[PDB]
Design a protein around this ligand. Sequence first.
Ligand SMILES: CCCCCCCCCCCCC/C=C/[C@H](O)[C@H](N)CO
Ligand SMILES: CCCCCCCCCCCCC/C=C/[C@H](O)[C@H](N)CO
Ligand SMILES: *[C@@H]1O[C@H](CO)[C@@H](O)[C@H](O)[C@H]1NC(C)=O
Ligand SMILES: *[C@@H]1O[C@H](CO)[C@@H](O)[C@H](O)[C@H]1NC(C)=O
Lengths: 48, 240, 240, 48, 41, 41, 294, 293, 50, 99, 48, 246
Amino acid sequence: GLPTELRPGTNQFLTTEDDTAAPILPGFSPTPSIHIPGEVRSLLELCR
Amino acid sequence: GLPTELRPGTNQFLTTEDDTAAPILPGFSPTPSIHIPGEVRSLLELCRVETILEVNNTTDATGLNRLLIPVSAQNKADELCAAFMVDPGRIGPWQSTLVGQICRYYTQWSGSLKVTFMFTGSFMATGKMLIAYSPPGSAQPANRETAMLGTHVIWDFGLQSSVSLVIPWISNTHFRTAKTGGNYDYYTAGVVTLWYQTNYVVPPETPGEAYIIAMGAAQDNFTLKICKDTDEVTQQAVLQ
Amino acid sequence: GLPTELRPGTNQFLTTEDDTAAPILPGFSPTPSIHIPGEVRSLLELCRVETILEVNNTTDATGLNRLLIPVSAQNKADELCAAFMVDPGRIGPWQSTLVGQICRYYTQWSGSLKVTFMFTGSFMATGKMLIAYSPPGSAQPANRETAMLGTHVIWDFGLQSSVSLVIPWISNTHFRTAKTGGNYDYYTAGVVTLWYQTNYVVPPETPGEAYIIAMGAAQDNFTLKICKDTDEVTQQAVLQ
Amino acid sequence: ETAMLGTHVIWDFGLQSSVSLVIPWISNTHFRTAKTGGNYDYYTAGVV
Amino acid sequence: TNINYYKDSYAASASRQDFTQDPKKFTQPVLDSIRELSAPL
Amino acid sequence: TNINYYKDSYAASASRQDFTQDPKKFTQPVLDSIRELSAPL
Amino acid sequence: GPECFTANGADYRGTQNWTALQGGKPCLFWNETFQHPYNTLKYPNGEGGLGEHNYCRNPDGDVSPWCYVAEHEDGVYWKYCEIPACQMPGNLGCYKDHGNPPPLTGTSKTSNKLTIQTCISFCRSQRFKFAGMESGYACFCGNNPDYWKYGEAASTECNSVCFGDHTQPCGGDGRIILFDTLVGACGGNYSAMSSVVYSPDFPDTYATGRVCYWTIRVPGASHIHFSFPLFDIRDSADMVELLDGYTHRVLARFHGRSRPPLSFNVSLDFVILYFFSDRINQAQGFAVLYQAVK
Amino acid sequence: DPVEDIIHDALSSTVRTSGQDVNTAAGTAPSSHRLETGRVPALQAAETGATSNATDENMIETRCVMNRNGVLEATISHFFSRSGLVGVVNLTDGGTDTTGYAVWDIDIMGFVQLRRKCEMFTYMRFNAEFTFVTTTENGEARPFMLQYMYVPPGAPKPTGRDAFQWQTATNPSVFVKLTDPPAQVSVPFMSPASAYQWFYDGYPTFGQHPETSNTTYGQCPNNMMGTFAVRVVSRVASQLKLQTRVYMKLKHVRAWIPRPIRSQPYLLKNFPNYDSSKITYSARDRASIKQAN
Amino acid sequence: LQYMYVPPGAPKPTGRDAFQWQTATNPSVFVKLTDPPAQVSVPFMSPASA
Amino acid sequence: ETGATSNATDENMIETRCVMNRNGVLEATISHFFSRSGLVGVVNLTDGGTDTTGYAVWDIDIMGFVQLRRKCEMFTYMRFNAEFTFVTTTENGEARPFM
Amino acid sequence: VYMKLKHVRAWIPRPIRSQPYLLKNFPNYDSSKITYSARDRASIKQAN
Amino acid sequence: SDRVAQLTVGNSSITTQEAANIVLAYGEWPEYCPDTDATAVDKPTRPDVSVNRFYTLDSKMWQENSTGWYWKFPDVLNKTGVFGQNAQFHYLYRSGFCLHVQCNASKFHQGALLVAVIPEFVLAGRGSNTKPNEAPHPGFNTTFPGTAGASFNDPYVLDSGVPLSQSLIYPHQWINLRTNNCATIIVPYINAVPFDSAINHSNFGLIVVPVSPLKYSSGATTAIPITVTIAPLNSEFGGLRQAVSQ
Ligand SMILES: CCCCCCCCCCCCC/C=C/[C@H](O)[C@H](N)CO
Ligand SMILES: CCCCCCCCCCCCC/C=C/[C@H](O)[C@H](N)CO
Ligand SMILES: *[C@@H]1O[C@H](CO)[C@@H](O)[C@H](O)[C@H]1NC(C)=O
Ligand SMILES: *[C@@H]1O[C@H](CO)[C@@H](O)[C@H](O)[C@H]1NC(C)=O
């Protein structure tokens, strides 16, 4: 195989990292959305 | 070597992931296939074919007669022949059709459903029938003048003894779920009820009873959702 | 480092995987080769060469005479000289040929098989023989008029004393498996049987018995399947 | 189940109450003769 | 885009999913392809 | 397409499989290449 | 001697109530075990040793003696019982196979309707005094006396059914059973002391008109004591005759109408067992047991 | 030309349902009332065996819906993509059991939940992805090592713990530890036939077949595909009660000839024997006919 | 450990040796306790649109 | 008798047919015939109180075990590269924290 | 200790040894027990 | 204009006037073995007329309390017809059948019939015992009834543990005594192997189940029979050998 080494910082469930995870339902199509008013996209939108 | 770190989610035999595994016979050629009919490629392909409902699923109806609803002449008109809840995932008649068995393997279902009704009476005996689907809400109606209001199809006998009703997919949401009861009856899909339109009029020297075969299936817009272990297996002993 | 996760199937010394390993002598030049005859590149190359069958594999036939079938004149005609089951993986005569030994290393086999029959009789003694392959079904036939019906080859003596029969690959499936017995005899490939066509006619002052050497091999369409530990080794003690 | 083996025609009733069978001309020779009996039954043409 | 780390074919996972549905094999397996809204008999 | 992570040759697994069969080396190792359907003697 | 004569354990009515000597299960009594198919309510008057006990019997026609036991979710509702006493004379036990070299290095064959006696008819046709089955389809003759080379094994897992008849065992896959050739035959001479004389074509039904003469010539024996543990004759024309050897004289007669006693002493030194049968209707078989006491 | 009868059929012996690729759900167009005779889609003839094509547009005043519901998850490829239990072994390596090994013949019919899925299709063809989870009877993992040899049909089966078959110079084997994530192996379609068969309306052999007990019935060997053995890697016995489940996935699946779903409970492994005394009726029993719950 | 998702309508497990753990359709996570935490992505599986 | 193989092909004996075969010969070549790993030797490093050596030497001889031996006996001269694998365990099959 | 063979090139095929092995570096068999390759049958014309 | 029907194979020529709509199993006609897939290296045989006839099985009478019947294919034809004498002499076999079943009744009678082919129609021992060596099993004559065709014992589960309610996934056609007195199916060769034995492996079954019971007012024909006429198409045979009965 490819040679490699594990750096530090492994096996740590970081609360705020952003990685992939195994999909649980392979080949899944969600319920298609609907145009709903009031779509907020920021919290600064609510501070104003 | 290349530096790396193991994220969480390792060493977990996920039942439904899709990864490679080491080939066990390296450099292997399989037995070449053969063109065989009946190659199915989808389960929606099997929901579009009719199978009989055990609509007469009553005590004192055992044997083969569960598949047949009786039909006799009615001296008094405005009579109720039969009725059944259309919910496939729910228990009831749809446990005997395929589309209700295969729906149980999934959670949610959508799309229109259709039922046919083959008449098995004599050639000379004739009669009109009213097939009324009622959307959800109250229970099944009391008299046919209350069951009119849903989508209904009126049926005349003669040749070509199989009419088709199609229950249109009406629902607030995009998908109803198969489980029904408690609060999941919010996804109930109404009740189909069959009424004597006029009568079962018979000539002399002919049997004054008959039967109808209620066959059901799914319309072309049938679509399904995530998988689910069915309920019709409760193996206790390991098979030896 | 790069993020990653270990899927299942790790740390497993799979006997048949195909991966790299750390070179033990870094920067090594081997001894340069030399052009040597007999470079084989396939095992099918070895199935196409004849080796003798121990068709006379009987009690009271010990020594070298297991490789030879007797042939004598028959006062009464319509006589059975010999017979053997064609199944190579099955025990029997094919344990002594290579193609039956090498087939045991694999599970399944396909392709036509062929057998030759060299005559070792005198030059003046002559005779006709019938070599009949019977497909599967019933057992070996009783009389030759029942063994005709399979593919058969009639043989005349003279010069050029080696005829060739080829058992055509006939089977419902694409591959028979080497194991035979129980329910695996569904993959049985019939029986080859050799009959006296006319007689072993001998002149005076000549021995009235002879022998035939049954040599077998595989036809060009011989193809094999996944590997298998053979049966002809049962080492008990470690070799010291 | 022994009379199947010849050429046979199966008939259903209903309207159009006349079916047609045709006995095909099968014979070793080109012409059968009208006389039948003795050795002239060599020209017999079967039985319907 | 799916990739296989071995030179065998049967180590892939979902190498080609396919949409191909033929209701005519099972739902209408009829010689005389009946009309869509007419009288069959 | 097969790849080696070392600068030596003998760390590869199946670097080139090959179909090459020569039955004439063993099955018919004859001077006078006999005819395919004639009398050899 | 054995408490059992036939190769399944039907006549076995032993005192064993366990299912094994090592690691034995306390077996449940036949009179509470009613959810299982065999009990004593719908079986009155003891069809197959059934009563108020927990002894392993064979009321189903199976290949072994067994009973019914529960489990701690690590067992099946029955269990084959191992009894070291019910090994019929003519059974050399069952042994584990290994491959090459075989213990019986005689002639090996294979069929698909192989019952037991078809091999014993085959090793007798080749004068090999021991036989061998492998998992109901394979035959294995041979004269070798070193069958014990690989190891003795229990008689429980040696019980894969024969393909010929589905009521008797023909060993296991990789496990051999060994039956002698003197049984399952007739004729010959018995110079041994206390051997066992079985029916022609035992365990099978005797064939259509099997007529043959046994010979028991013992040197200097005072009296010969016969017995009839298994003796079931159905047609009257099928008879068994104990003849004198010197003068060819009739001494006793048994057939389907004259039932046998327990035993009776035959006080001579050279006796002949004569057997004659009919073509039409057959019966199970008979087993006897002589004791030359000087 | 010599005779027309032989060239006519041979020329006319040539080959005698172009379905489209459906990516989404089926939409619908509107429809108005139509009051005309001669044209009726309701009054079909289900007696011909055909499905009635009474589409929704042709019955009621429908609307226009451009659907978007995905049909991806309903195909057979992702219907069998789930792994599932197949067998358990009981490698009871202790003081009493002087074997040290346990052999188990591969039979997926042993457990119902995976069985009932593949019964829907009579002929299947696929590649497998086996997974051997490993543990003790207490669920505990320990520092030990196991061996997992596949023993094809005809191979010598292992005889004990120190057997020579574990030399495995040809048989594929998996050497794995018990403190390890589960071993996972892909397996190809290794049938001698062209496709697997869960059913066989006959016998493997020729000859007579009795009518009192037919144990050879319905046993095709093309699917019967050998055994699979396990030992702990040790020449002397370590006292532990082991029990390893084996799981498989089905990939690259191709089905054929759909079969109804079995409703009655299973009683045996290789035979679909039900019980006449307890016929499990598929539908639940209702009160009367006109009392939909 | 074993971690099976039991959707609505599925048979719920009854005990430790239950047949529902055969999980031929239900997604399950088989994981060890000496393991970094198991992590799984889950889609929007509502019957509704939101 | 000339030592040649008879070339009596199937077409030349019987009324054959047309078959365009597809059975793969990939797995029968020598490259994938020896690709299987296999046992070669065992060592007995009996490190204890009695045995005051602490080491065990083993000369490489693949002839020691039959199942790999009988394969390479089929070919008189061979040339290859090897991929050794040293599985490690105790007599009880137990793994331990050692080096 | 286990080994694999890769990049193999053979030469001069040799028959397969049938007799059991007795030594390591010498192919010594035993004259007293010649293991016959084929299993012993009943007679010549009795294919099992 | 559609009720009539004329099928003629071989020297036979069947006609039905009231029944309508031929249903073809799975939308593929019966065809010969292609060159690129066959394994039997020898030439197979194509009689195409002697064997491709409409052989008629025996009549089975329908009573008001009847249960059902079934057959097996090509098992029903091994003692009769040239096809019988062709299957006993050949190890290999391939054909595609043209089923056709008839049930005549008056316009005053009532009743229906489910006709369906069942691929690989195994049967099931009818017993609660799970002892492996004492397992109930169907006899030979029960699973291979021959030309006569045995009856069911519990048709609601097809004597195989499969509910009849779902039995329409298979190719089928309903006989219903108000509109059609007959039915027909054209089925191809369905087998995972290109050829098979003819006296060991039955390719498929056939079921004729009285779903709706025959009911008539008293004073009419009481004995209603059922006949099935069968006809192989594109038959094949290979591997000639001696006779084999079973
Ligand atoms: C060393 C690797 C061990 C894993 C390999 C074991 C062999 C796996 C072959 C899979 C064969 C197809 C799946 C088997 C299904 C059923 O057992 C049979 N079809 C009939 O019962
Ligand atoms: C530190 C690495 C340890 C592994 C290296 C050990 C040396 C391996 C050399 C392999 C030589 C060829 C294979 C040997 C085969 C037989 O032993 C000999 N041909 C004769 O017995
Ligand atoms: C077995 O032996 C006798 C009865 O046969 C009795 O004394 C003993 O307690 C029995 N044991 C069991 C476990 O039933
Ligand atoms: C059942 O049999 C056992 C053993 O003989 C006996 O102890 C018990 O009293 C019996 N019970 C009944 C109800 O007969």
